[PDB]
Short mmCIF file of C-alpha atoms and ligand atoms in Angstrom, two decimals:
data_model
loop_
_atom_site.label_atom_id
_atom_site.label_comp_id
_atom_site.label_asym_id
_atom_site.label_seq_id
_atom_site.Cartn_x
_atom_site.Cartn_y
_atom_site.Cartn_z
CA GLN A 1 13.43 42.69 17.32
CA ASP A 2 14.72 42.89 13.76
CA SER A 3 15.50 46.59 14.22
CA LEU A 4 16.53 48.76 17.17
CA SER A 5 17.40 52.44 17.58
CA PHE A 6 18.11 54.69 20.52
CA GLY A 7 19.51 58.18 20.87
CA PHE A 8 21.22 60.00 23.71
CA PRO A 9 21.62 63.65 22.65
CA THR A 10 22.95 64.17 26.20
CA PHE A 11 23.22 62.07 29.36
CA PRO A 12 20.92 63.20 32.21
CA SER A 13 21.64 61.54 35.57
CA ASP A 14 18.21 59.89 35.38
CA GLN A 15 19.21 56.72 33.48
CA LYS A 16 17.32 53.41 33.41
CA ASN A 17 18.71 51.58 30.36
CA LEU A 18 22.45 51.86 30.92
CA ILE A 19 24.64 49.23 32.57
CA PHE A 20 27.47 50.97 34.43
CA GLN A 21 30.59 48.97 35.18
CA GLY A 22 33.71 50.02 37.07
CA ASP A 23 34.04 53.75 37.68
CA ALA A 24 31.64 54.98 35.00
CA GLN A 25 29.01 57.51 36.06
CA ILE A 26 26.92 60.46 34.87
CA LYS A 27 28.23 63.96 35.59
CA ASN A 28 27.17 67.24 33.98
CA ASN A 29 24.90 65.52 31.45
CA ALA A 30 27.82 63.44 30.18
CA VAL A 31 29.19 60.00 30.99
CA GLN A 32 32.54 60.05 32.82
CA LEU A 33 33.94 56.63 31.94
CA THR A 34 37.01 57.08 34.14
CA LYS A 35 37.14 58.35 37.73
CA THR A 36 37.67 62.03 38.56
CA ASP A 37 38.29 63.81 41.88
CA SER A 38 36.20 66.35 43.80
CA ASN A 39 37.21 69.27 41.60
CA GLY A 40 36.69 67.17 38.47
CA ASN A 41 40.28 66.22 37.67
CA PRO A 42 41.24 62.81 36.21
CA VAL A 43 42.95 60.25 38.45
CA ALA A 44 45.21 57.26 37.82
CA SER A 45 44.31 53.57 37.97
CA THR A 46 40.69 53.73 36.86
CA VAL A 47 38.50 51.76 34.45
CA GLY A 48 34.89 52.29 33.45
CA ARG A 49 32.39 51.00 30.90
CA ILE A 50 28.72 51.38 29.98
CA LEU A 51 26.47 49.08 27.96
CA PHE A 52 22.95 49.65 26.69
CA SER A 53 20.63 47.19 28.49
CA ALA A 54 18.71 45.98 25.43
CA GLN A 55 20.48 43.23 23.50
CA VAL A 56 21.20 43.77 19.82
CA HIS A 57 20.42 41.08 17.26
CA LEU A 58 23.62 41.23 15.19
CA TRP A 59 22.89 38.19 13.02
CA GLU A 60 20.29 35.45 12.71
CA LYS A 61 21.49 31.98 11.73
CA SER A 62 18.13 30.55 10.67
CA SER A 63 17.23 33.40 8.31
CA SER A 64 20.84 33.79 7.19
CA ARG A 65 20.58 37.52 7.91
CA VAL A 66 23.21 39.93 9.21
CA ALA A 67 22.53 43.33 10.74
CA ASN A 68 23.82 46.57 9.30
CA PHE A 69 24.59 49.06 12.05
CA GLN A 70 25.62 52.62 12.66
CA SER A 71 26.92 54.14 15.86
CA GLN A 72 27.37 57.89 16.10
CA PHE A 73 28.91 59.51 19.15
CA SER A 74 31.21 62.26 20.32
CA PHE A 75 33.73 62.43 23.16
CA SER A 76 36.42 64.70 24.54
CA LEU A 77 39.60 64.00 26.51
CA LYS A 78 41.11 66.38 29.04
CA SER A 79 44.23 66.16 31.16
CA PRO A 80 46.45 68.50 33.23
CA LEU A 81 49.39 66.58 31.78
CA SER A 82 50.36 66.51 28.10
CA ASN A 83 50.52 62.79 27.41
CA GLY A 84 47.19 61.59 28.81
CA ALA A 85 46.24 57.90 28.84
CA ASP A 86 44.95 55.49 27.94
CA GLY A 87 42.01 56.01 25.63
CA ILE A 88 38.35 55.32 24.95
CA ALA A 89 36.80 52.55 22.88
CA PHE A 90 33.47 51.67 21.32
CA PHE A 91 32.85 47.93 21.51
CA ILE A 92 30.45 45.09 20.76
CA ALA A 93 30.59 41.91 22.84
CA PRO A 94 28.56 39.00 24.29
CA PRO A 95 25.67 40.23 26.50
CA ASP A 96 27.20 39.00 29.77
CA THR A 97 30.50 40.82 29.24
CA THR A 98 32.20 42.27 32.33
CA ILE A 99 35.48 44.07 33.07
CA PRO A 100 38.29 41.46 32.94
CA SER A 101 40.72 41.32 35.88
CA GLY A 102 43.81 43.45 35.29
CA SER A 103 42.34 44.97 32.12
CA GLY A 104 43.37 48.46 33.22
CA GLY A 105 45.75 50.85 31.48
CA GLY A 106 46.60 50.05 27.88
CA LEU A 107 44.22 47.09 27.85
CA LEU A 108 41.43 49.68 27.92
CA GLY A 109 39.27 47.52 30.19
CA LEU A 110 38.56 45.13 27.34
CA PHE A 111 41.15 42.37 27.58
CA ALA A 112 42.80 40.24 30.24
CA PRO A 113 46.60 40.58 30.44
CA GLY A 114 47.23 36.90 29.82
CA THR A 115 45.01 36.70 26.76
CA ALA A 116 45.07 40.27 25.41
CA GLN A 117 46.65 39.12 22.15
CA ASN A 118 45.10 35.65 21.84
CA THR A 119 42.42 35.97 19.14
CA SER A 120 40.91 32.55 19.83
CA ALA A 121 40.41 33.52 23.48
CA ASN A 122 38.31 36.66 22.94
CA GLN A 123 34.97 37.73 21.47
CA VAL A 124 35.07 41.45 20.83
CA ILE A 125 35.08 44.09 18.14
CA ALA A 126 36.20 47.51 19.28
CA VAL A 127 37.09 50.87 17.77
CA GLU A 128 39.78 52.31 19.97
CA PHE A 129 41.05 55.89 20.24
CA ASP A 130 44.47 55.27 21.76
CA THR A 131 46.50 58.15 23.18
CA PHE A 132 49.30 56.26 24.97
CA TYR A 133 51.83 54.11 23.12
CA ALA A 134 54.98 53.77 25.25
CA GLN A 135 56.69 50.65 23.86
CA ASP A 136 57.68 49.42 27.33
CA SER A 137 54.07 48.93 28.48
CA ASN A 138 52.06 48.97 25.22
CA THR A 139 54.38 46.84 23.09
CA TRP A 140 51.56 46.07 20.63
CA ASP A 141 51.03 49.71 19.58
CA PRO A 142 52.60 51.58 16.67
CA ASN A 143 54.58 54.50 18.13
CA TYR A 144 52.14 57.39 17.77
CA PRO A 145 48.56 58.16 18.84
CA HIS A 146 46.04 56.38 16.66
CA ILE A 147 42.55 55.09 15.99
CA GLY A 148 42.37 51.33 15.64
CA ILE A 149 39.98 48.53 14.80
CA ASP A 150 40.37 45.67 17.28
CA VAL A 151 39.08 42.19 16.46
CA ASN A 152 39.60 39.83 19.43
CA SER A 153 42.94 41.47 20.25
CA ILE A 154 44.48 44.58 21.77
CA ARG A 155 46.81 44.65 18.75
CA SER A 156 44.67 46.42 16.16
CA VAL A 157 44.18 44.69 12.81
CA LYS A 158 44.15 48.16 11.23
CA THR A 159 45.15 51.63 12.46
CA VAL A 160 45.44 55.22 11.30
CA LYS A 161 47.55 58.00 12.79
CA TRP A 162 45.42 60.26 14.95
CA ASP A 163 45.90 63.59 16.73
CA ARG A 164 44.86 64.03 20.35
CA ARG A 165 43.44 67.47 21.09
CA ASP A 166 42.88 68.26 24.76
CA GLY A 167 39.31 69.35 25.50
CA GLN A 168 38.13 69.11 21.89
CA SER A 169 35.08 66.99 21.03
CA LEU A 170 35.60 64.30 18.41
CA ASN A 171 32.63 63.34 16.25
CA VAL A 172 32.62 59.69 15.27
CA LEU A 173 30.59 57.62 12.84
CA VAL A 174 31.00 53.84 12.87
CA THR A 175 29.12 51.81 10.29
CA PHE A 176 28.99 48.15 9.36
CA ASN A 177 27.68 47.15 5.94
CA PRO A 178 26.68 43.44 5.90
CA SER A 179 26.63 43.47 2.09
CA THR A 180 30.33 44.38 1.75
CA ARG A 181 31.33 43.36 5.29
CA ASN A 182 33.14 46.66 5.74
CA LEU A 183 33.36 48.28 9.15
CA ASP A 184 34.05 51.97 8.46
CA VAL A 185 35.18 54.59 10.93
CA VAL A 186 34.98 58.32 10.24
CA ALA A 187 36.17 60.74 12.94
CA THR A 188 36.27 64.52 12.62
CA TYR A 189 37.09 67.55 14.78
CA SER A 190 34.91 70.67 14.49
CA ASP A 191 37.44 72.38 12.20
CA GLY A 192 36.95 69.65 9.62
CA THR A 193 40.07 67.59 10.35
CA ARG A 194 39.10 64.06 9.28
CA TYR A 195 40.38 60.53 10.01
CA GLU A 196 39.23 57.35 8.32
CA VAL A 197 39.94 53.66 8.73
CA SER A 198 38.04 50.60 7.60
CA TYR A 199 38.35 46.86 7.67
CA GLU A 200 36.51 43.92 6.16
CA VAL A 201 35.22 41.55 8.83
CA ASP A 202 32.60 38.81 9.01
CA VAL A 203 30.91 39.49 12.34
CA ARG A 204 29.19 36.09 12.29
CA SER A 205 32.49 34.28 12.80
CA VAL A 206 33.53 36.64 15.58
CA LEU A 207 30.45 37.36 17.70
CA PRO A 208 27.35 35.46 18.88
CA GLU A 209 23.92 36.25 17.37
CA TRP A 210 22.92 38.54 20.25
CA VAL A 211 25.33 41.12 21.63
CA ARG A 212 25.61 44.31 23.65
CA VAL A 213 27.18 47.60 22.63
CA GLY A 214 28.84 50.23 24.77
CA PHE A 215 32.04 52.09 25.60
CA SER A 216 35.09 51.44 27.71
CA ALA A 217 37.93 53.64 28.94
CA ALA A 218 40.90 53.38 31.26
CA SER A 219 43.82 55.29 32.75
CA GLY A 220 46.88 53.49 34.11
CA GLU A 221 49.73 55.52 35.59
CA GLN A 222 49.00 58.27 33.06
CA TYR A 223 45.52 59.79 33.06
CA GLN A 224 42.88 61.90 31.35
CA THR A 225 39.11 62.16 31.55
CA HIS A 226 37.20 60.12 28.96
CA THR A 227 33.95 62.05 28.55
CA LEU A 228 31.20 60.52 26.37
CA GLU A 229 28.92 63.39 25.33
CA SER A 230 26.33 61.92 22.97
CA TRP A 231 25.43 58.63 21.33
CA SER A 232 22.92 57.30 18.81
CA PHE A 233 22.72 53.74 17.55
CA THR A 234 20.62 51.89 15.03
CA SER A 235 20.65 48.30 13.83
CA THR A 236 18.61 46.48 11.17
CA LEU A 237 18.78 42.80 10.17
CA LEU A 238 19.21 42.44 6.40
CA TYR A 239 19.37 39.74 3.73
CA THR A 240 22.53 40.20 1.66
CA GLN B 1 17.55 57.88 25.70
CA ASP B 2 15.37 60.69 24.35
CA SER B 3 14.31 58.47 21.45
CA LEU B 4 13.82 54.71 21.26
CA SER B 5 12.56 52.47 18.49
CA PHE B 6 12.22 48.76 17.80
CA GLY B 7 10.41 46.54 15.34
CA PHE B 8 9.09 42.99 15.38
CA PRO B 9 7.93 42.10 11.86
CA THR B 10 7.47 38.60 13.36
CA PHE B 11 8.33 36.89 16.66
CA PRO B 12 10.97 34.16 16.29
CA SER B 13 11.23 31.92 19.37
CA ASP B 14 14.70 33.27 20.12
CA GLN B 15 13.87 36.36 22.21
CA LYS B 16 16.11 38.35 24.55
CA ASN B 17 14.35 41.68 25.10
CA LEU B 18 10.83 40.56 25.99
CA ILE B 19 9.55 40.13 29.52
CA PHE B 20 7.04 37.29 29.58
CA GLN B 21 4.44 37.20 32.33
CA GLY B 22 1.73 34.65 33.04
CA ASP B 23 1.04 32.17 30.24
CA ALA B 24 2.43 34.30 27.41
CA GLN B 25 4.91 32.55 25.10
CA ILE B 26 6.22 32.45 21.53
CA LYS B 27 4.66 29.92 19.16
CA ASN B 28 4.83 29.72 15.37
CA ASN B 29 6.57 33.10 15.07
CA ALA B 30 3.81 34.84 17.01
CA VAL B 31 3.14 35.71 20.64
CA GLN B 32 0.38 33.57 22.14
CA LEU B 33 -0.64 35.78 25.07
CA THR B 34 -3.14 33.29 26.49
CA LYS B 35 -2.60 29.55 27.06
CA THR B 36 -3.36 26.98 24.33
CA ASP B 37 -3.28 23.17 24.47
CA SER B 38 -0.90 20.99 22.44
CA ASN B 39 -3.28 21.28 19.47
CA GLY B 40 -3.10 25.07 19.65
CA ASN B 41 -6.68 25.34 20.91
CA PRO B 42 -7.51 28.05 23.48
CA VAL B 43 -8.26 27.05 27.08
CA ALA B 44 -10.12 28.83 29.89
CA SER B 45 -8.64 30.51 32.98
CA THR B 46 -5.52 32.05 31.45
CA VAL B 47 -3.69 35.38 31.55
CA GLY B 48 -0.52 36.51 29.80
CA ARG B 49 1.44 39.68 29.11
CA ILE B 50 4.70 40.79 27.50
CA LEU B 51 6.69 43.97 28.04
CA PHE B 52 9.66 45.32 26.12
CA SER B 53 12.65 45.19 28.51
CA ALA B 54 14.00 48.69 27.83
CA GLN B 55 12.17 51.43 29.70
CA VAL B 56 10.60 54.25 27.70
CA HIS B 57 11.15 57.85 28.73
CA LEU B 58 7.54 59.07 28.44
CA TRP B 59 8.14 62.57 29.82
CA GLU B 60 10.83 64.60 31.56
CA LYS B 61 9.96 66.97 34.41
CA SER B 62 13.10 69.12 34.55
CA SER B 63 12.79 69.50 30.79
CA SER B 64 9.07 70.11 30.22
CA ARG B 65 9.25 67.58 27.39
CA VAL B 66 6.72 64.87 26.55
CA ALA B 67 7.18 61.93 24.23
CA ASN B 68 5.59 61.59 20.84
CA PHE B 69 5.07 57.87 20.33
CA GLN B 70 3.58 55.43 17.85
CA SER B 71 2.70 51.76 18.24
CA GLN B 72 1.73 49.76 15.15
CA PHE B 73 0.64 46.17 15.63
CA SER B 74 -1.49 43.33 14.35
CA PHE B 75 -3.20 40.47 16.08
CA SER B 76 -5.83 37.81 15.43
CA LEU B 77 -8.34 36.01 17.64
CA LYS B 78 -9.82 32.52 17.20
CA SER B 79 -12.40 30.51 19.08
CA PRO B 80 -14.73 27.59 18.27
CA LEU B 81 -17.15 29.20 20.74
CA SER B 82 -19.74 31.77 19.68
CA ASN B 83 -18.57 34.09 22.45
CA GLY B 84 -14.78 34.11 22.67
CA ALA B 85 -13.37 36.13 25.56
CA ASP B 86 -11.98 38.21 26.98
CA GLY B 87 -9.84 40.45 24.81
CA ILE B 88 -6.39 41.88 24.21
CA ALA B 89 -4.87 45.21 25.17
CA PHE B 90 -1.89 47.40 24.38
CA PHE B 91 -0.86 49.17 27.59
CA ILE B 92 1.57 51.59 29.19
CA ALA B 93 2.41 51.16 32.87
CA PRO B 94 5.14 51.74 35.49
CA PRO B 95 8.34 49.69 34.90
CA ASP B 96 7.72 47.27 37.77
CA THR B 97 4.21 46.33 36.63
CA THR B 98 3.20 42.68 37.17
CA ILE B 99 -0.05 40.74 36.75
CA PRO B 100 -2.47 41.78 39.54
CA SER B 101 -3.86 39.00 41.72
CA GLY B 102 -7.28 37.93 40.45
CA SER B 103 -7.06 40.07 37.31
CA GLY B 104 -8.24 37.39 34.89
CA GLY B 105 -11.28 37.32 32.64
CA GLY B 106 -12.92 40.70 32.11
CA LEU B 107 -10.16 42.52 33.97
CA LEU B 108 -7.84 41.59 31.08
CA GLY B 109 -4.90 41.03 33.42
CA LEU B 110 -4.56 44.77 33.99
CA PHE B 111 -6.65 45.49 37.08
CA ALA B 112 -7.24 43.96 40.50
CA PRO B 113 -10.93 43.31 41.34
CA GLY B 114 -10.90 45.57 44.37
CA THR B 115 -9.74 48.69 42.53
CA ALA B 116 -10.63 47.91 38.90
CA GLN B 117 -12.68 51.11 38.77
CA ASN B 118 -10.81 53.24 41.32
CA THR B 119 -8.82 55.60 39.08
CA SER B 120 -6.84 56.83 42.07
CA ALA B 121 -5.62 53.28 42.68
CA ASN B 122 -4.14 52.64 39.23
CA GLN B 123 -1.42 53.92 36.91
CA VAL B 124 -2.16 52.66 33.43
CA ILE B 125 -3.24 53.69 29.94
CA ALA B 126 -4.48 50.95 27.65
CA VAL B 127 -6.29 50.44 24.37
CA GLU B 128 -8.51 47.39 24.68
CA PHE B 129 -10.18 45.22 22.08
CA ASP B 130 -12.94 43.78 24.21
CA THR B 131 -14.99 40.88 22.84
CA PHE B 132 -16.90 39.78 25.95
CA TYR B 133 -19.57 42.07 27.38
CA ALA B 134 -22.05 39.90 29.33
CA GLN B 135 -23.98 42.54 31.28
CA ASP B 136 -24.08 40.30 34.36
CA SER B 137 -20.31 39.93 34.75
CA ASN B 138 -18.76 42.82 32.82
CA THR B 139 -21.26 45.36 34.14
CA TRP B 140 -18.87 48.18 33.20
CA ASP B 141 -19.03 47.44 29.44
CA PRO B 142 -21.43 48.70 26.76
CA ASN B 143 -23.62 45.89 25.39
CA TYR B 144 -21.48 44.87 22.37
CA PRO B 145 -17.87 44.12 21.28
CA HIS B 146 -15.81 47.30 21.27
CA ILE B 147 -12.50 49.13 21.23
CA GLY B 148 -11.90 51.13 24.39
CA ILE B 149 -9.45 53.61 25.85
CA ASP B 150 -8.69 52.87 29.48
CA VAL B 151 -7.20 55.43 31.86
CA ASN B 152 -6.71 53.97 35.35
CA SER B 153 -9.98 52.02 35.12
CA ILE B 154 -11.46 48.95 33.40
CA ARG B 155 -14.46 51.18 32.68
CA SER B 156 -13.32 52.80 29.43
CA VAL B 157 -13.31 56.60 29.31
CA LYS B 158 -14.48 56.04 25.76
CA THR B 159 -15.59 53.18 23.49
CA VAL B 160 -16.61 52.67 19.87
CA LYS B 161 -18.44 49.68 18.40
CA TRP B 162 -16.12 47.04 16.99
CA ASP B 163 -16.71 43.88 14.99
CA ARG B 164 -14.88 40.69 16.02
CA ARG B 165 -13.76 38.60 13.03
CA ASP B 166 -12.53 35.11 13.90
CA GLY B 167 -9.09 34.31 12.53
CA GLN B 168 -8.68 37.65 10.75
CA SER B 169 -5.78 39.99 11.47
CA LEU B 170 -6.56 43.48 12.69
CA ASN B 171 -3.94 46.17 12.04
CA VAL B 172 -3.76 48.86 14.69
CA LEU B 173 -1.96 52.21 14.88
CA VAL B 174 -1.89 53.98 18.27
CA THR B 175 -0.26 57.41 18.34
CA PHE B 176 0.14 60.16 20.93
CA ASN B 177 0.79 63.78 19.99
CA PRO B 178 2.09 65.81 22.99
CA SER B 179 1.09 69.15 21.41
CA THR B 180 -2.61 68.33 21.23
CA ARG B 181 -2.43 65.69 23.98
CA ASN B 182 -4.44 63.48 21.64
CA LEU B 183 -4.25 59.71 21.86
CA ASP B 184 -5.49 58.42 18.51
CA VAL B 185 -6.46 54.86 17.63
CA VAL B 186 -6.93 53.61 14.07
CA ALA B 187 -7.70 49.96 13.38
CA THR B 188 -8.40 48.17 10.11
CA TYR B 189 -9.21 44.74 8.69
CA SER B 190 -7.69 43.70 5.34
CA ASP B 191 -10.95 44.54 3.51
CA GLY B 192 -10.72 48.21 4.43
CA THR B 193 -13.22 48.18 7.31
CA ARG B 194 -12.04 50.96 9.61
CA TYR B 195 -12.46 51.96 13.26
CA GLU B 196 -11.32 55.20 14.90
CA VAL B 197 -11.41 56.62 18.40
CA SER B 198 -9.55 59.55 19.93
CA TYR B 199 -9.15 60.97 23.43
CA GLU B 200 -7.38 63.94 24.99
CA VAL B 201 -5.19 63.04 27.95
CA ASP B 202 -2.12 64.52 29.60
CA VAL B 203 0.06 61.48 30.25
CA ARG B 204 2.15 63.41 32.78
CA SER B 205 -0.72 63.38 35.27
CA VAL B 206 -1.25 59.64 34.85
CA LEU B 207 2.09 57.89 34.37
CA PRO B 208 5.60 58.22 35.84
CA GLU B 209 8.43 59.65 33.67
CA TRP B 210 9.73 56.19 32.79
CA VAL B 211 7.42 53.37 31.75
CA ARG B 212 7.28 50.04 29.98
CA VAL B 213 4.98 49.18 27.09
CA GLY B 214 3.45 45.84 26.17
CA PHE B 215 0.34 43.73 25.70
CA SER B 216 -2.05 41.88 27.97
CA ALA B 217 -4.79 39.33 27.32
CA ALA B 218 -6.99 36.98 29.32
CA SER B 219 -9.77 34.40 29.12
CA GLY B 220 -12.14 33.50 31.93
CA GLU B 221 -14.85 30.88 31.44
CA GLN B 222 -15.07 31.84 27.76
CA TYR B 223 -11.88 31.62 25.72
CA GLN B 224 -10.06 32.37 22.49
CA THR B 225 -6.47 32.71 21.34
CA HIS B 226 -4.98 36.22 21.47
CA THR B 227 -2.17 36.13 18.94
CA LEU B 228 0.14 39.13 18.60
CA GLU B 229 1.57 38.89 15.07
CA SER B 230 3.75 41.99 14.71
CA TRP B 231 4.75 45.11 16.60
CA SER B 232 6.83 48.24 15.95
CA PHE B 233 7.23 51.08 18.41
CA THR B 234 8.93 54.46 18.43
CA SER B 235 9.01 57.42 20.79
CA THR B 236 10.85 60.74 20.92
CA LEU B 237 10.85 63.44 23.58
CA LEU B 238 9.58 66.77 22.26
CA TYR B 239 9.12 70.27 23.67
CA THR B 240 5.60 71.31 24.67
C1 LIG C 301 55.43 56.35 33.88
O1 LIG C 301 54.54 55.33 33.45
C2 LIG C 301 54.94 54.58 32.35
O2 LIG C 301 56.09 53.80 32.72
C3 LIG C 301 55.83 52.88 33.81
C4 LIG C 301 57.14 52.19 34.13
O3 LIG C 301 57.44 51.19 33.16
C5 LIG C 301 54.73 51.89 33.43
O4 LIG C 301 54.44 51.03 34.52
C6 LIG C 301 53.46 52.66 33.03
O5 LIG C 301 52.45 51.73 32.59
C7 LIG C 301 51.18 51.90 33.15
O6 LIG C 301 50.57 53.12 32.75
C8 LIG C 301 50.34 53.23 31.32
C9 LIG C 301 49.74 54.61 31.07
O7 LIG C 301 48.64 54.87 31.93
C10 LIG C 301 49.43 52.09 30.83
O8 LIG C 301 49.34 52.13 29.41
C11 LIG C 301 50.01 50.74 31.26
O9 LIG C 301 49.11 49.70 30.92
C12 LIG C 301 50.29 50.71 32.76
O10 LIG C 301 49.06 50.78 33.48
C13 LIG C 301 53.79 53.65 31.90
O11 LIG C 301 54.18 52.95 30.73
O1 MAN C 302 -14.53 34.82 30.19
C1 MAN C 302 -15.78 35.46 30.37
C2 MAN C 302 -16.03 35.81 31.83
O2 MAN C 302 -15.73 34.63 32.61
C3 MAN C 302 -16.07 34.79 34.00
O3 MAN C 302 -17.43 35.10 34.07
C4 MAN C 302 -15.25 35.93 34.62
O4 MAN C 302 -13.88 35.55 34.69
C5 MAN C 302 -15.39 37.23 33.82
O5 MAN C 302 -14.43 38.18 34.27
C6 MAN C 302 -15.18 37.00 32.31
O6 MAN C 302 -15.54 38.17 31.60
CA1 CA C 303 47.86 52.11 24.03
CA1 CA C 304 -15.28 42.88 28.70
MN1 MN C 305 46.37 50.85 20.35
MN1 MN C 306 -14.50 46.92 27.85
#
């Protein structure tokens, strides 16, 4: 299809169009990307991802068209600790994507350790919300929590300082304009605190014509719950 | 998802979200539901269907919500014969639906001969554009080409006279309003000729909560091409 839209105001346990990978599962009408114990507390060493089953037509070579897209979603992070890890990310990747071996912790379940920073070895665009930046393990991160745009690498091509607020929902709007090639990210807390970061990228030279969209989250030795609360997505092929 | 939408202004051969069954296949940017020779001429004894891969949430029990959906589409039929058969249908069925054994010809690839008229044996709602009505074989049909609403039976719960126009595209809009439980059908030819038929049905008592939507067509001894040219669909769960 030239256009596709779907909306999850909430996440009932009765799902048919979601691909669950790793420890991701539905709980309390929300998607718990990372594993939690009996009483609902986050645990260490866990990775989880979900992908919408239907493939998205990002660009069409024959017609020379590129899709414009918009992903709106909200999530919250909670942890008994203070410095919870590792973060949640919205990503777009080839349809057959799976969790890479050893992609836990700071790799957010998106990259393989050996190729995490090799751009020519990956096919992924992700918008990460990174809460852990210890320079001993996450050498690629600036030293402060942040939102980043990742293009084939765990080392963001662009970042903005971000504030982690335990148990507070973050509203996010991600949009890609094929006419200007800008991928814009707008994130805001209920009180109006706003964060913005954008980057110009030609998706055609990064991803195949058909892709899949979803979320990924992980917790290494440090942990926190990565709760996806709602999600709407729409894509339309356009001639620029 | 509570809401789902997709649009096929045309059907390029590169498809990822369509489930092809029987002889259905993409040709010249359109879906040829029934088999055609190398010259593009229709042949006898053929059945084909397509379904959108993503499942539609028609209604939700624990929520008392029912979907409001719309399906807009256009198709054309051609045959050198004076009595092209058998017809094309838009249908809604359980996710695992497949072509019933011996469902060709007048059964349009939707019903099995043994239970074609046993409403308690089927789970399907379809809008048929029936062009073959020989009273000796299709005993269940009125004596003329027609548009019919089928609810668990090949014997339409309602029909209205329709005119078959070789090689001319018919534009159809099928909508369901959960408040009035009205399934409305509006079809038009490019010259303004219009056909309408409506029927009150509670989909909850006929179909499961999750379903797949698509088209079916067949040709027995008489044949014709059943070409699906475009299709857009949208559905949203509403309170009732
Ligand atoms: C106390 O944990 C920190 O220090 C350890 C000793 O160097 C590291 O092994 C540890 O790294 C792991 O956990 C973090 C946080 O969950 C994660 O980002 C990293 O990829 C490892 O899984 C952490 O730095
Ligand atoms: O194709 C016209 C006609 O052909 C045969 O008689 C049978 O397959 C019927 O079901 C069908 O209606
Ligand atoms: Ca990090
Ligand atoms: Ca008939
Ligand atoms: Mn980072
Ligand atoms: Mn009929």
